[PDB]
Amino acid sequence: PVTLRTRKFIRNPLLSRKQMVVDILHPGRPNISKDELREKLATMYKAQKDQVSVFGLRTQYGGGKTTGFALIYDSPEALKKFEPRYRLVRAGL
Amino acid sequence: LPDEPPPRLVVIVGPPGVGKTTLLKSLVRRYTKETMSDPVGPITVVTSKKQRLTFIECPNELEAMIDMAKVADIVLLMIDGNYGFEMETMEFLNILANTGMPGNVFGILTHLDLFKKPSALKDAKKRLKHRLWTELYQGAHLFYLSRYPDREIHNLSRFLSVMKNPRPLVWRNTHPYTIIDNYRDITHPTKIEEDPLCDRTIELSGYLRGTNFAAQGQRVHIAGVGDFTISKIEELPDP
Amino acid sequence: EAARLDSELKLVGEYGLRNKREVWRVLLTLSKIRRAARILLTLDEKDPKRLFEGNALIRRLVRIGVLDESRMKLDYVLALKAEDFLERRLQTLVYKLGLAKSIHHARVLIRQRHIRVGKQIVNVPSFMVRLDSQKHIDFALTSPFGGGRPGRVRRKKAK
Amino acid sequence: GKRQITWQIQKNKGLTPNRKKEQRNPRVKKRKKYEEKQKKLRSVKAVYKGGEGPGGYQGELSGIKTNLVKSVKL
């Protein structure tokens, strides 16, 4: 499956999002489907499906490792007033 | 032949996509003034101060393709994307290299929508451009149209609007020809009605292209049907 | 001439190469290295750029394993030849380390992705393998020779 | 129902000189060239090719010639 080790988290009290590094892996699988990863960052740091923003997400060489730079909010209106537009329409919003 | 020129003739050649031929035909129609649907055979189009043009739909009969291959002033070579070439494009291309080489032949390429990947479209574009380069001229101008754009047909107009010289081919310097624009059938009603098939007088009307005609009693060949004699010449005046 | 034709034919036959371009490439790099050793020999010993610069050059060629680690002198680094570089190249280390049956089989087993070098897998058979990295030349993991799936012919054979 | 173009049409080979499958790959061609010029040096000079093999000296195979002096005067 997917393995999940988060690096360099920041609580980010300035915007009430969280400046997170989330380093994942898929060894042996095809690629990881970041919307399903928006169904993966729901219980690990207590976020709903709206307030899981993910970007960066460059897969490391040879399969396996995949770096992801994510940002979970605390409210969907903070998502909308603190989130960029292409990230919204790509995020189904 | 340094004439104050007639409409320069442009050919639209290609495989049996008739919708491709009338596609580009009505497309450059909407580039110029009109917006009409049904194409007459030869249709002149006014462009700027040097020389207006005229456009034709080559049918899928390659006897007509060798007729208009004898005619053609400049060439538009309309070709598929996902299919490579078909045979009729090559037959016209070296049939024109054999008959007489015009000053400008251009490739133009359709069906770019029917693909899956831009890597496949780009690879087939570079390959197909190379085969036009080895069949036609080293570094010729090919073009692309994905189904009714306007910018691609605008720079296309910026290439067929800067007519250089209709380079002095010998047969088209010393032989008189005229593509019939308006078909006109003059017959007495008891000749056409009383006799089902006797003969009929035909006023074909068109633009004098070749060398100067005979002032009286000219023999004249008509493609497919054969050589006939001119019973009468009239001339519509011009501004 | 003919001395170059039999010389470079002996190099392209001893070591499995494709053209004479790689021979000329190796003789070019040896011309640069041997040139640098010459113009370091122009100065006396205790010229500190001959000491430190020539010392650095012989340490680098000991490290990539061309010059043998016993001899430690710049005349002995002037005395080199292209069979040292071709003897240090990856393809000939596949054959001389016995993963392959012949040298052309080794170049096939390198463009074919079957071998790895450490963590990388290496497609280029002209890879100048370092002397320290010589030992870890082995078959790649997804190859049929390093475990993995048994490849196309045995797949169509099982089916 | 479109007219397919054939292979010489796509690649105008035309009239090229007929060449060899060994000439198709240059690495195979220098492999088959070194094997032959390794073979011809066996005919001219004397190669070591191992000492006594398994059986242990069945005599001087391929004859002995007594008049012949194959040596460099020095």
Place this chain on the structure above:
Amino acid sequence: FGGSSHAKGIVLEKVGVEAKQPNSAIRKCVRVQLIKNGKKVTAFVPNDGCLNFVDENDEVLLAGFGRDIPGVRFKVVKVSGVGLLALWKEKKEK
């Protein structure tokens, strides 16, 4: 003919098409009207098959040599833009 490397020309008369020997120099040489110089020089068409491609009045590019008539000096390289060896092989039409 030392200022430029290739000179264009008009094929003026195919000199000696009535010869008997198929690849003799009499049949190979062709009279050429040089364009910029105005002179008439003959040049070697390298085959009788290529002589079947060299036609009258055509624009023909020529070059030199380097080494039955030793003294005819030029060489036909193209006929009407297409190279004459690519016409000799079945590469291109004209």
Place this chain on the structure above:
Amino acid sequence: ARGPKKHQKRLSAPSHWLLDKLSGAYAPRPSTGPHKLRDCMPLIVFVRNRLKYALNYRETKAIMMQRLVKVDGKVRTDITYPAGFMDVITIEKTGENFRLIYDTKGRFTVHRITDEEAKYKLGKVKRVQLGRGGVPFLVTHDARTIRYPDPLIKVNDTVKIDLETGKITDFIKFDTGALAMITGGRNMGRVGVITHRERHDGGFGIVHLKDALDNTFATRESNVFVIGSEKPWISLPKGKGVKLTIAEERDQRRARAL
């Protein structure tokens, strides 16, 4: 040239900001305000580069416009207007602040600092002269005008205001034999201790300085900045601002490394 532009060039971008050489042509030019070009430090450069508390200007304006950040108690919703000198910057939730100081190398650094030590300010006198009403008032070096001070408090004193009305609660006296920051010359941005003052009729009378380890340099009164008598008001910068050699301070860093 010939009137103001707002475009900053990137090869000529100066030392205090740490701007990238990449990302197109233009750099974040600061516009008008209290200070000059040199000691300026915008919130653009501050919260995005010095703190890494930003991603782009949707986020930075989305911080600045919602009235959470204060500069001297003012809202300051502007990107191009500067932040000052020896600065007091607010993160009022959890009770922390940011003093901008020099390092031991001479460029600005952030500091999380308390509400009291932040709530007073060290601001230099630029001028004490006569205005309307017949009173000599005090033009500060940084922002404000301290009207009706003590009448003998003159120029080059560096004043503990309480930042709240701009009123002198203390001053540091311009003196020979006192400890001063230097901001200019060949040795700019250094904590030192002045040994002498010279008069120099003809422009910019100077001070001779001799530090803790007997290094002498004589710099002018326009760049000297008397930062403390002893009385540790402000936070201490790293290494006491002595600016020793790179090799010996490097060996001290390897000695104090954990």
Place this chain on the structure above:
RNA sequence: GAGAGGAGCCUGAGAAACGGCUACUACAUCCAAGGAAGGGCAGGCGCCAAAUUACCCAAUCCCGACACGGGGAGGUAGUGACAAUAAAUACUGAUACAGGGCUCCGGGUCUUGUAAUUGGAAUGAGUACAAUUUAAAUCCCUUAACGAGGAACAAUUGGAGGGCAAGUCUGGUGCCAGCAGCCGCGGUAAUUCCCUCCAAUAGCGUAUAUU
């Protein structure tokens, strides 16, 4: 630094603002012939054809009642054998048959071949689900699946040399010799017949100037 053109004028914090007014000077467009509006660089051809009429303000940055509205800075991509770089077009067995192969007038050497019959593995170009990267796409990084037996997934550019007819042409004291030969009695769904060597080799030839 100087800007359809002299001559004057107005705004503003900043302009003798001109891609803003007023005459005069040189042209030129709509007209119902009285009147009116008018004063750029880029593109193609040129002094037989070869570098897109690309997508974006997402970044970095700039301006305005100002979180929105605007950006010909900048970024992303496309062509490109002028170079420069890596290197595909195969690897490995088994048997059978043949007795010569090669090298310098006579010498010298001992295993060599086969348009011989069979058996193995290896797949990467490519085809391509997906997901991801991104303003959006693409390249990349992953990637399931298909993907090799020559008549193919179809390596070239130069040179040297041999052989050949109920063919042709030329010379000459028969039967010889020359140059040469896609061309021969029939036959075109007619025929299944002849090559070797050298060089560079995804590159190579040619011409002149030449060093």
